[PDB]
Design an enzyme around this catalytic site. Structure first.
Site, PDB file in Angstrom:
ATOM      1  N   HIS B  41       0.815  -1.215   0.000  1.00 31.26           N
ATOM      2  CA  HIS B  41       0.000   0.000   0.000  1.00 31.26           C
ATOM      3  C   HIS B  41       0.868   1.295   0.000  1.00 31.26           C
ATOM      4  O   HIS B  41       0.302   2.372  -0.124  1.00 31.26           O
ATOM      5  CB  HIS B  41      -1.116   0.014   1.071  1.00 31.26           C
ATOM      6  CG  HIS B  41      -0.656   0.174   2.487  1.00 31.26           C
ATOM      7  ND1 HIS B  41      -0.593  -0.911   3.347  1.00 31.26           N
ATOM      8  CD2 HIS B  41      -0.298   1.290   3.161  1.00 31.26           C
ATOM      9  CE1 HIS B  41      -0.169  -0.426   4.502  1.00 31.26           C
ATOM     10  NE2 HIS B  41       0.019   0.892   4.442  1.00 31.26           N
ATOM     11  N   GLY B 143       2.219   6.016   9.804  1.00 30.54           N
ATOM     12  CA  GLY B 143       3.654   6.004   9.563  1.00 30.54           C
ATOM     13  C   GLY B 143       4.327   4.724  10.033  1.00 30.54           C
ATOM     14  O   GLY B 143       5.461   4.435   9.619  1.00 30.54           O
ATOM     15  N   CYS B 145       3.414   1.569   9.447  1.00 27.97           N
ATOM     16  CA  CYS B 145       3.320   0.442   8.525  1.00 27.97           C
ATOM     17  C   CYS B 145       4.711  -0.003   8.026  1.00 27.97           C
ATOM     18  O   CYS B 145       5.576   0.826   7.801  1.00 27.97           O
ATOM     19  CB  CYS B 145       2.368   0.768   7.377  1.00 27.97           C
ATOM     20  SG  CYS B 145       0.777   1.419   7.933  1.00 27.97           S
TER      21      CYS B 145
END
Ligand SMILES: Cc1ccncc1N(C)C(=O)Cc1cccc(Cl)c1
Ligand SMILES: Cc1ccncc1N(C)C(=O)Cc1cccc(Cl)c1
Lengths: 304, 304
Positions: B41, B143, B145
């Protein structure tokens, strides 16, 4: 989302861990620049710990009696001195992995991470708090002495604790990196009982703000209180007296949530008086006191 | 003495953390050998997350659109591929700090440490468990991830989790290092509700053994039970059914304490039926289920 008992990343402290052997006693040392810091009881046998006279026992030790091993390579000891309850072993090589560091003596209520080590090797990292009775509720076995407690501010490691002793009640005692014990403890195999372990009130309030920030709000009530009224209740439940200094430090949390410090104190007052009635706050069934207001801010903002 | 929610030392994983930027999205990457692993993503904008078609969105991305930064130096991306929900960025330099590693898919009940990161920089380390509903109760903000979950066996890091998503209920979802999501979750900004979060029974029993080992014994009763009788009670309190496989894994703890597994199950049965009556076990007012029998053995023995 979520609130966890989080330790600082331990890499900078792992690169400092060495094994120190003196005779038949092996413990952990902290290698910063060309100096290895370790508990002075490394020179003691089990017979010596009953009533050790460390100055006398140090007389029979030379530089070559201290074996310092980093990984699997031997460091050459070119000097040794005793500073309070720690030994400082001057080695001939500066630790290439020495990070930016300070030695700080923390106050009770302050939290820190511990890198538990055995034979110079790290086994795990956890978060602690210096209790109001100057003990820490760590997780240490025989061989863990010399493991250190620390905080990190971006690239600087502030070392604040060195593990020395296990009290007969399973709680732990240790020094700052100048060898000064926290509390009244002495490095002797003598029964030393801990004082009252009161709850760190400023930390409970900070954790109640962290709970409001993450969605747990059931405990917010319609009441307010005063510092003197809150403190009468705090005294009854063995909670540390709350000062205006603590209120000031909770200010950023009060500003973010919009809940006045004294209003959150009234919620904490009702939680003490009524209990949690089988409920939980941030996955805990008791009031957590090992997160400072700084820890809540850092965790809730993402400080790296 | 003492029992703490302990994470593995994080140094070996800190040396693997990089920042990955694609367009205006920045997240964390894991750099092992000449490959950077990150959530797919990273190629999405907020508009894209509603219903992303990742194969289509990847078509418009070239090697030069992925900016990989390690510390403050830029890694050259010489290849890119999508494996399930992770992107693999082939870089022209092997990570000099790559430790011995494996990629493992863990089962629910298994615990691991998470090194929470923001912009390729570590902020903290904590212990988690893969819940029976395949979520983790982490502490992650925007942030984070690409932050990873792992276990260490002496010198080998087994990476088991990569953080991807926050469900609307504040719980977290992610993949193994092959990009396969744990549970039924999809990397899409769509409401996905979690299943029942049942208690990991084998872990509660393991923690009750850790409590007996450390001095908390009040909960030991005069009763015993059978696996079928214990399981009737476990079903009522949303506890995972206990199997003979779990009994086998508790064997070393049963042997050390001299308390039969089924006897400890009867103690757990009475704790579920009566509650803790305002008491605590290892400083907790609820039954802890995020220590496996292996974690108790390791912590209680000092495995480094
Ligand atoms: C057994 C154990 C468990 C956890 N942490 C530490 C220990 N050890 C090694 C000691 O308390 C030794 C000791 C005894 C008396 C005084 C001092 Cl200064 C040190
Ligand atoms: C906000 C936040 C907090 C904690 N952890 C993660 C997040 N983020 C960044 C997301 O959930 C983004 C996201 C949305 C939808 C699907 C996916 Cl795969 C990812």
């Amino acid at each position: 989302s979520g609130f966890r008992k989080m330790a600082f990343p331990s890499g900078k402290v792992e690169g400092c861990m060495v094994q120190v052997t003196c005779g038949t006693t092996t413990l952990n040392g902290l290698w910063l620049d060309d100096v290895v810091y370790c508990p002075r009881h490394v020179i003691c046998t089990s017979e010596d710990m009953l009533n050790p006279n460390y100055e006398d026992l140090l007389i029979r030790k030379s530089n070559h009696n201290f074996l310092v091993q980093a990984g699997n390579v031997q460091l050459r000891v070119i000097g040794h001195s005793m500073q309070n309850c720690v030994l400082k072993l001057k080695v001939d090589t500066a630790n290439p992995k020495t990070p930016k560091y300070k030695f700080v003596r923390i106050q009770p209520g302050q939290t820190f991470s511990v890198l538990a080590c055995y034979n110079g090797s790290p086994s795990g990292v956890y978060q602690c708090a210096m209790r109001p009775n100057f003990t820490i509720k760590g997780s240490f076995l025989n061989g863990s002495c010399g493991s250190v407690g620390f905080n990190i501010d971006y690239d600087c490691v502030s070392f604040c604790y060195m593990h020395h002793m296990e009290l007969p009640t399973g709680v732990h005692a240790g020094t700052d990196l100048e060898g000064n014990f926290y509390g009244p403890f002495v490095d002797r195999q003598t029964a030393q009982a801990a004082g009252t372990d009161t709850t760190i009130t400023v930390n409970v309030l900070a954790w109640l703000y962290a709970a409001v920030i993450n969605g747990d709000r059931w405990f917010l009530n319609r009441f307010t209180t005063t510092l003197n009224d809150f403190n009468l209740v705090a005294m009854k439940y063995n909670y540390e007296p709350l000062t205006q200094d603590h209120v000031d430090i909770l200010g950023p949390l009060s500003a973010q949530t919009g809940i006045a410090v004294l209003d959150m104190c009234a919620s904490l007052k009702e939680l003490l008086q009524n209990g949690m009635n089988g409920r939980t706050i941030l996955g805990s069934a008791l009031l957590e006191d090992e997160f400072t207001p700084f820890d809540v801010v850092r965790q809730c903002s993402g400080v790296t």
